[PDB]
């Protein structure tokens, strides 16, 4: 609603070169790049302010930028290194008020030396215990979504065709399913959680829906196992009497 | 332009306290003080503050510069769940922002009448997974110990029309030892968490 980025998940080569957007709808005219990494918070990149102007911030160094159009503020990886993994943060503010930065929803990028990992998450819905609706009145929908990698995945609830957002929880940090593995694959739960009463209408259908971003169509692939490319994975449950 | 200290390091609070969240800042042209909230990754703006003992109130937030003292104070009364974040304070020195390490704030409901139990769903399709739930906030959930068993930290949702949060905790495996009678042994769960059979 106030400022949006290029996709909130990216994962790409070592030596490649990254291409990150920043547009926003708030006709500002300062923008700025950020990263934001465990322990540091966040550093500035670049900023721009205004239409083709540029000045470098604390930690330019690997990157470059463009403002080619006031709506837009372009971040360039020349040569994606390892340690350019990080979370990419974007912000814009008026003119009279540069420090009040409003910020976009940022884009996670990892950086790998190839992609043989990437693996799509499979998907099970499962169903509410007769001994909680019984004891509680309330039933619980747990969808687990499991084998995946990397972590870059969205969960969602839909309830007769509609997303869902009350009576929902997912896990904020998912499991590495190999804790001692540098490439464990992760898996996530979450709940949804309804009165017995609409649980137990039949007609009333649950879906898990996990948004996967993995591969895009340019990506190469030249192993047996299905490409593991950008794909929604869902399970599904209809209520029962 | 050196430096932005926050205090408390991070805070863990019942729904309904009030808690007052401080920042000292030692820069050279300061101009102004700002507070963010980060829920998950991305900051949202709160407050500017340019001019000392002028609170600015938004809803339950309210903050205040003094700078004389050098501080700025950000007090969030009536605390609910979704108040739940990093704070982060940083200052302005006409150049550029300065950032502090930021308060981590948890906020865990309040459960009045807790329902501990752990109950074993089934699978819509054809494994199966363990739901520890209705315990009350204080009640800490122990990662696994075995690495073939998967256990997730606690969650809590809010059934808002009901005005009701609940607690909860996933336990599954596909090994053949394992139950929902022993999924949270690691745990430490009340003595009268309910086992249906």
């Known amino acids: 609603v106030k400022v949006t980025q290029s996709s909130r998940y990216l994962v790409k080569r070592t030596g490649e070169k990254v291409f990150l957007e920043c547009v926003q709808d708030?006709?500002?005219?300062?923008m700025f790049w950020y990263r934001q990494d465990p322990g540091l918070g966040l550093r500035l990149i670049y900023f721009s302010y205004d239409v083709k102007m540029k000045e470098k911030g604390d930690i330019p160094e690997g990157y470059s930028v463009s403002r080619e159009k006031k709506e837009r503020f372009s971040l360039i990886l020349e040569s994606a290194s390892t340690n350019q993994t990080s979370m990419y943060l974007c912000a814009s503010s008026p003119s009279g008020y540069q420090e009040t930065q409003y910020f976009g929803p940022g884009t996670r990028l990892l950086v790998l030396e190839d992609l043989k990992n990437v693996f799509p998450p499979e998907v099970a819905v499962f169903e509410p215990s007769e001994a909680e609706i019984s004891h509680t009145q309330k039933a619980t929908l747990v969808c687990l979504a499991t084998g995946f990698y990397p972590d870059h995945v969205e969960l969602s609830w839909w309830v007769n065709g509609k997303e869902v957002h009350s009576g929902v929880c997912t896990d904020p940090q998912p499991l590495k399913e190999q804790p001692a593995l540098n490439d464990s694959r992760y898996a996530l739960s979450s709940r949804l959680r309804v009165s017995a009463t609409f649980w137990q209408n039949p007609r009333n259908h649950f879906r898990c829906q996990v948004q996967f971003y993995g591969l895009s169509e340019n990506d190469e692939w030249t192993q047996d196992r299905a490409k593991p490319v950008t794909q929604i994975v869902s399970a599904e449950a209809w209520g029962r009497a | 332009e050196d430096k932005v200290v926050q205090s408390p390091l991070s805070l863990v609070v019942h729904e309904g306290d009030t808690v007052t969240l401080n920042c000292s800042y030692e820069v050279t042209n300061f101009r102004s003080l700002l507070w963010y909230k980060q829920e998950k990754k991305a900051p949202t703006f709160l407050f500017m503050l340019?001019?000392?003992?002028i609170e600015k109130k938004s809803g339950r937030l309210s903050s205040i510069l003094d700078k004389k003292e050098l501080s700025s104070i950000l007090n969030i009364t009536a605390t609910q769940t979704g108040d739940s974040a990093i704070y982060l304070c940083?200052?302005?020195?006409?150049?550029?922002?300065?950032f502090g390490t930021g308060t981590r704030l948890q906020v865990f409901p309040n459960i009045q009448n807790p329902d501990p139990a752990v109950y074993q769903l089934r699978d819509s399709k054809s494994k199966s997974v363990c739901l520890f739930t209705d315990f009350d906030s204080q009640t800490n959930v122990s990662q696994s110990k075995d690495s073939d068993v998967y256990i997730t930290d606690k969650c809590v949702l809010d059934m808002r029309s009901m005005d009701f949060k609940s607690n909860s905790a996933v336990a599954w495996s596909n090994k053949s030892d394992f139950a929902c009678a022993n999924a949270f042994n690691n745990s430490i769960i009340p003595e009268d968490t309910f086992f249906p059979s």
């Open positions: 940083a200052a302005y020195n006409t150049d550029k922002l300065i």
């Open positions: 340019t001019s000392s003992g």
């Open positions: 708030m006709d500002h005219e300062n």
